[PDB]
Structures are given as C-alpha cells and as structure tokens.
Ligand binder design. Structure first.
Ligand SMILES: O=C(Cc1cccc(Cl)c1)Nc1cncc2cccnc12
Ligand SMILES: O=C(Cc1cccc(Cl)c1)Nc1cncc2cccnc12
Lengths: 304, 304
C-alpha cells in the first residue's frame, strides 16, 4: 500500500555520467560504448548564446578541445560530430559500465526519471512527465545541462531526454538522444513560447484507479458518463480529450478495480466540476497527472 | 529553477541489495562488507507471525538454511546472529560494491530516500520523511521487506531505515540498521497504534522559502508573528511547535531570501487560517512537509 512519485533506480545511468568541458563551459555528458553525448552549446561562450552559428563555432574546435573526465579518469577524444543539437564525442575507450540501452523518442504525456547532474556527478533523481506542450517541469540549476531522462525495462535503459535549457518561465526544454528538441524550442538565449499546456487526462484517470487500489475511494459516485459528455467537461477544464485508445490502456486498471472506465470518467467529471472540497487523494489536494496507466500497474505490482 | 521531491541517486545502494530466503520466506537483505542485514521475520512462516518467539524460531535454523543470492551468484553463510529485529548473516565474501557507509538513527521530521526492492532487485526510488509518529508513508508491497532508507553525503551512504511492516492503516514501520524499531512497533501480526501524527513545521517553512526562491510568492504578506503567537496557531492545526533551534536551522534560507523567519511564520499562519483559496505553491495544493531546510538548500544549490 501507499503511492509515491517513484523514480527508476538510477545506478545504471550514474555509471554513464561524465563531465565535458570546452573552453570555459562545463556541462554533463552521457558515455555509452565509445561515444560521449552532450548538448552542443558546450562550445559556446555566454556571448555566443545570443544567436549562435553552431557550425561555425564547432569548426574552431578540435578533438583536444573537448575535455571529458569520467570521475577522476580523463578520456581521450578521437572524433567529434554534431547531430542536430547534440555533440557526439568519440572516445578511445568503451565505457565498461555501459548498460543495455536504447535511444527513444517519448510521446507527450509519458513519464520518465531524470538523474540531475552537475560536473559529471549525480545529485538527485526524480520522476516527471513530458508535458503535452513538450516542456518538462524539472528541478535544474546552471550546470545541469546534459543530465538525462530515462525509463528502465528489466536490464535495458531507454534514454529519452537530454536537458538543454531553462525557459524564462522556469520550465525546461531538451532533446531526444539524437539531439532533436521536444517541442518548438531552439538552443538560443531568446524568449520562446512554450504554448498552451493541458492536463494529461489518461494519467489523472490512472491515478484515480491507483487511489481506489490504495483505499482512497471517497470520490467514487453513483454516476456514469460517455466519451462525448466527458470530453465537453475536459474541454472546459483544459484536459486532453479522452479517446478509445486511452480507454483501452486503462483496461487493466478497470479490470483490477471492477470500475468501468466511463464510471471513473464520471468521478473525474464531478471532481473537475466541484473541486476536492478540502479533501485529499493519495496525499494530494489536486488532480495528479504524472503517473501513466503503466506506472500505476508497475508500482501497484512491484516490477523490478 | 523548479522544485521536485528529489531522491538521492541510488546506485551505491543498488550494489548492496541481495535476496535472502529462509524456509519458504524471501525478502531483501543489505550486503555491506562481509555481513548481510535483513529483517528477522525472514525466519517465520505466516502462522508464526501471530506471536513469534524469535529466539526459539532462530534456534531451529542453521547457516545453511539462509539462502543469500547477490543477483545471480550465491553467497556462503558462515555465521548468523540476531540483533534486536535484524538478522546479521556473516558471509565468506566481502561485497566488492560496498560503498563508504554509516549506520545512523534519524530523528522524526528528517527525510531520506527509499530504494524499494523485491527479490533482491531494485524496483524504484523515492523520497520521504520519518513522520513525527515514527511511521513512514511509503510505497511498499509484499516482498519489499528489507528495502532500506538512506541519505548520501558525497561518497558516504548513511543507512537509516530498513523496512519491516505495513500497519493495518497502510502506513509503514521499520528499524534502524541495528534492528531497533522507530516508534512503538513490534514485529508481530497484531493491530498496533501509531499514535497522533503532526505536521513538520520547520519543513513547511523550509518549503515556503523554496517556493520564494523559485518564484512562488503570492502567499507573502505584510505581517509578522512571534514564536508564542505562531505556536498557538500551530497547536490548533496539529503542527509541531516551532523552537529557536528550528529558527536557527532556517537561518540560511532566511539570509538567501531576506525574509525573517518570523515573517515567514506569519505567512504560514495566514495559510493555515485561510487555506490556499484554490491556489498552488510549487505545484502543490497543500502545505508540504517532506523537505527539510537542508534538503531545500541542497536542491537549490546543486550538491552532488
Ligand atoms: O538554460 C541554460 C543555458 C542555456 C541558455 C540558452 C540556450 C540553451 Cl540551449 C542553454 N541553462 C540551464 C539549464 N537548466 C536550468 C538552469 C537554471 C539556471 C541557469 N541556467 C539553467
Ligand atoms: O507487513 C508485512 C509482513 C509482516 C507482518 C507482520 C509483522 C511484520 Cl514485521 C511483517 N509485509 C509487508 C510490508 N510492506 C508492505 C506490505 C504490503 C502488503 C503485504 N505485506 C506488506
């Protein structure tokens, strides 16, 4: 019993973190096999970040300018290339601690763990969701660039995010491990619109099922709704429209609790229209959307 | 910017987890140097848990009855002893992955990370507080016994908690690494009073300072209070009385923000008396007490 914002164990990722320095900028890199991945803005000075021409800036750099240090040991750089917004530094030594891994592009609404790092050293781990507007509400300070987001399935780490930037609004933007930004962001010191965010409906429903499993049931009502009626309410409250694909992935939670997905939608509709009335659900006074249906089943079944 | 319920990176602890089996019960153990620590109830069957005489139950067991497996490799047990509610299994091999460590008894109100494990395998990591009533509001399923709580200072892991039991109320109880229960609990299948819990005032104030640092300032008011006046309000709302020792540990956060501790107490007093009025602070609609002043400074300064 109990329900927490649980992160994946970070050990497999801690073994991949290194410090990358170029000129006077230092950030984090991810060492997998014989390649170190890091944000390409490691080649910029603060003056360059205004409107950087990364191709020209990288031309002035050579392999010996990229200082890569894995804990205490120095790595020898034998190649460098820019792929989208990431630099790939080929090193002469394969990381002996490379776990089984994949590079994945996650969908908005999906969750992942972040291992926040500074100077190649891990500082903390937390769980978060990729917002529908492709930002993340992380906890990151200067020097955290190059920290990564990931998920783990048994022995395989699927890397989905590399941290690059904090918007003027205090939210975070980054790329997949091929250097493609999630969302419309560019790696420049310019104000950039994140765009309208929405609440991840399928995740709120999954968390309501997690509440029922853990004993919080006060919000269950005698009502039902339809996808159409629920979606009129979701529109009004800035929630993502619920589809049959979302109902389908909620199937296991519906079977576990015996509560039909549309009946749980009616509970969600009532909570959106009336609020919580000073009550809480799983220690929260708001509707939580950072747990996917897969996260709820994993946490409520103990997958290792 | 951003503020998350951040856990310590769990890699150093993942390297210590093993599976311990005795008879038909399997739980987790912590392998440090040549000793494996685990809850002593690993020697019980379900029938024994009613009123176990652990001394008699352990007398029927020999070294060869304790099966300890570290991932895939089997450990040879050359000694066993019971210390309070933990068993210490001496093994013939020192754990090569033993980090620098200490065994500490944490105070109520302090925080720590839990590495939830099943069958010696890590499943997730989360941050929590030891409640004033010596329970923890964890996320644990059957088989999670032996999972540990810890803090990390640079390269040293201070182990503070070993999980033992879930109370009928769904909250969790466990011991320090010398096997002493936190709180009045006994390792028996009997209903046990946890006792009145309270909100950790110093931690709510620390989190309010974290909110100001991260830009959430709507709750700041034109008022001040005294320790005596604030404590009348704290009494009414089931908050721990604030002392000068708590004001002293809030000093760094007061210096960072320029907000006197008693002025922040007046903000807390107003939030307790009026509620949040449908507003949020750091993504929460309630007053959070799972961040200590040290946690706030660590997260807002990036200690690795
Ligand atoms: O945003 C930047 C630097 C930057 C500037 C423009 C474009 C790009 Cl790609 C990167 N770095 C940081 C990341 N996360 C959090 C922060 C907190 C404080 C200060 N810097 C932070
Ligand atoms: O509480 C027990 C077993 C037990 C019974 C009596 C005394 C003692 Cl020391 C231990 N184990 C579990 C721990 N945490 C969470 C659980 C969730 C479901 C089922 N068991 C759980």
């Amino acid at each position: 019993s109990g329900f927490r914002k649980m992160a994946f164990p970070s050990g497999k990722v801690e073994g991949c973190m290194v410090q990358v320095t170029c000129g006077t900028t230092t950030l984090n890199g991810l060492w997998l096999d014989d390649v170190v991945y890091c944000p390409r803005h490691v080649i910029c000075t603060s003056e360059d970040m205004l409107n950087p021409n990364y191709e020209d800036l990288l031309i002035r750099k050579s392999n010996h300018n990229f200082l890569v240090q894995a804990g205490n040991v120095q790595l020898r750089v034998i190649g460098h290339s820019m792929q989208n917004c990431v630099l790939k530094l080929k090193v002469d030594t394969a990381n002996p601690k490379t776990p089984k891994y994949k590079f994945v592009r996650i969908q908005p609404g999906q969750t992942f763990s972040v291992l926040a790092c500074y100077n190649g050293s891990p500082s903390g781990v937390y769980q978060c969701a990729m917002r529908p507007n492709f930002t993340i509400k992380g906890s990151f300070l200067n020097g955290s660039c190059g920290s990564v987001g990931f998920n783990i399935d048994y022995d395989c780490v699927s890397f989905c995010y590399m941290h690059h930037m904090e918007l003027p609004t205090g939210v975070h933007a980054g790329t997949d491990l091929e250097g493609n930004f999630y969302g419309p962001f560019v790696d420049r010191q310019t104000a950039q619109a994140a765009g309208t965010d929405t609440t991840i409906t399928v995740n709120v429903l999954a968390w309501l099922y997690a509440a029922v499993i853990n004993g919080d049931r006060w919000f269950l009502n005698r009502f039902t709704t339809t996808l159409n009626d629920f979606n009129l309410v979701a529109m009004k409250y800035n929630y993502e429209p619920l589809t049959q694909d979302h109902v389908d992935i909620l199937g296991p939670l519906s079977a576990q609790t015996g509560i039909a997905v549309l009946d749980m939608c009616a509970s969600l509709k009532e909570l959106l229209q009336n609020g919580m009335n000073g009550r809480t659900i799983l220690g929260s006074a708001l509707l939580e959307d950072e747990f996917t249906p897969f996260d709820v089943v994993r946490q409520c079944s103990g997958v290792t």
